[PDB]
Design a protein around this ligand. Structure first.
Ligand code: M7G
Ligand code: MG
Ligand code: MG
Ligand code: MG
Lengths: 173, 62, 259
């Protein structure tokens, strides 16, 4: 009835909650995606295929830190430092055990952090989102360009607008 | 030697000539049943090395 | 970018299921929920993932065959099994169901055309072709490319001629095997999936004909004459071209004002 979906909601949460323990609330989930990455002025195929999910991340604590996973451009640069990254992205990789992650910090409270406390570890590049060539083009906080594919055009343009609504509207509740 | 090999000859003036080869000499090329992309079919063509532009070897002999 | 913790080295078979369920089954489009045969394809993927990575990192964890696994998967999440069918009977339906799904493969030949690339699968001893069952709504050539890349680590794209195949129907299973020429033999043909292909090698075409003609005991034992004809029509053409090439290579220097 709906008990088949409340469980689906809880289980979708609790499982992601083990990869990312700071999930205040899951935003949504589209069951098909494939990561592509802009290399030699072309888009290359990446081993992450599976359910896409954007969630609200608890941010949190004054000194909450992001620990390191136990082990040239082909590799995305791990996010080290303080916990500021308000929202997150995950592709529950059906391929291999490791999953795809993009920390989505609002372009609003990004400059707010890096100029009040000018103590800069990494240079967070205000994330950009657009749609071109049946791909949701996402420029990342560390200059890399990742494009994800959904079969449905409604799904491709729904995740887009939301990704914008996060980096544009300030994080309030 | 190269007799029987149907060859195609492209010319820079704007003309193209097909036809099967009859005589090969480094100064002159002669064709049997030369068909031209201008609407002319001739059974004997003689052309010199200097007045020639592009070449392709269309078919081999039977 | 954002750093995530690997929860799979030390994990409870209980929480390993809950994980895998969200990864594969639980979160899929209701169009792949139409049949029981539909959902059991995820259970098949999930079980292959469990025994490919989960059981790897967890020595202590059981060894789970699709039978046991899928049967456990329901014990943990009963809200995923909707229909009043036992996963025992439902899995034998699935196995017999698979036996109808048509295979699309390839005949991998080198520029030389003396040798053909053939693979043998883990459990078996019979040499056959890189080949697999079609997916949901995917064209014959695309399924061939997906299946040949998965089996040999080669993207066939370039050499895939669409009207140049070989079709045969062996026991209610449609085989459509494309004819590919120009493949490089030096490249390392490692498969991309664990526990599917045992050995991959270049068996010499002539050798095979001579042994097939003896009748001993391969889809190649039915597509023999079509394959031989294709080779004949290809060596014939590739060499006819090197006769025309030399006829040209000599004209473009005996007269030819080559640049
Ligand atoms: C991709 N996959 C294929 N199998 C094996 O390969 C067999 C055939 O499975 P198939 O993928 O349905 O056939 P296809 O290759 O013709 O498309 C199965 O019975 C398994 O033995 C697999 N076995 C394991 N353990 N892991 C995998 O990832 C895997
Ligand atoms: Mg196969
Ligand atoms: Mg296969
Ligand atoms: Mg398959």
């Amino acid at each position: 009835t709906e008990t088949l979906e409340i469980y689906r909601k809880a289980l979708n949460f609790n499982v992601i909650a083990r990869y990312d323990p700071k999930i205040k609330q899951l935003l949504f989930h589209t069951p098909h995606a494939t990561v592509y990455k802009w290399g030699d002025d072309n888009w290359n195929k990446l081993e992450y295929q599976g359910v896409l999910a954007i969630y609200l991340r608890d941010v949190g604590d004054k000194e909450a830190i992001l620990p390191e996973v136990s082990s040239e451009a082909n590799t995305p640069h791990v996010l080290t430092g303080h916990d500021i990254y308000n929202y997150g992205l995950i592709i529950m990789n059906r391929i291999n055990p490791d999953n795809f992650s993009l920390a989505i910090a609002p372009n609003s409270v990004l400059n707010k952090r890096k100029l009040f406390a000018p103590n800069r570890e990494e240079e967070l590049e205000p994330m950009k989102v657009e749609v071109r060539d049946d791909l949701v083009m996402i420029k990342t906080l560390k200059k890399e360009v990742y494009g994800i594919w959904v079969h449905t055009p409604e799904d491709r343009q729904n995740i887009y607008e939301l990704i914008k609504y996060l980096l544009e509207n300030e994080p309030t509740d | 030697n190269f007799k029987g090999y149907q060859i195609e000859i492209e010319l820079k003036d704007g003309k193209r000539i097909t036809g099967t080869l009859k005589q090969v000499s480094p100064k002159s090329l002669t064709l049997t049943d030369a068909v031209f992309q201008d609407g002319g079919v001739s059974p004997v063509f003689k052309i010199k090395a200097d007045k020639l532009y592009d070449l392709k070897v269309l078919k081999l002999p039977p | 970018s954002l750093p995530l913790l690997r929860p799979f080295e030390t994990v409870s078979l209980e929480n390993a299921v809950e994980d895998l369920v969200v990864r594969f089954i639980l979160n899929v489009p209701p169009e792949d929920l139409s049949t029981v045969e539909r959902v059991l394809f995820h259970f098949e993927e999930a079980s292959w993932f469990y025994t490919d990575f989960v059981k790897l990192m967890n020595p202590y964890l059981p060894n789970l065959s699709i039978k046991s696994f899928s049967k456990i998967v329901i014990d943990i999440c009963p809200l995923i099994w909707n229909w009043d069918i036992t996963p025992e009977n439902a899995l034998v339906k699935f196995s017999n169901y698979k036996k109808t799904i048509p295979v699309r493969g390839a005949a991998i030949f080198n520029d030389s055309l003396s040798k053909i690339l053939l693979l043998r699968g883990i459990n078996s001893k019979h040499w056959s072709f890189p080949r697999g069952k079609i997916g949901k709504d995917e064209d014959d050539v695309a399924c061939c490319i997906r299946e040949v890349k998965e089996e040999t680590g080669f993207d066939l794209t370039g050499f895939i001629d669409a009207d140049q195949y070989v079709e045969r129907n062996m026991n209610g299973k449609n085989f459509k095997i494309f004819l590919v020429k120009g493949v490089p033999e030096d490249f390392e043909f490692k498969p991309e999936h664990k526990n599917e292909i045992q050995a991959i090698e270049w068996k010499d075409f002539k050798k095979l004909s001579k042994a097939i003609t003896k009748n001993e005991g391969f889809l190649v034992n039915s597509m023999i004459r079509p394959l031989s004809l294709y080779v004949k029509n290809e060596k014939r053409a590739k060499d006819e071209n090197k006769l025309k090439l030399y006829a040209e290579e000599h004209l473009k220097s005996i007269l030819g004002l080559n640049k």
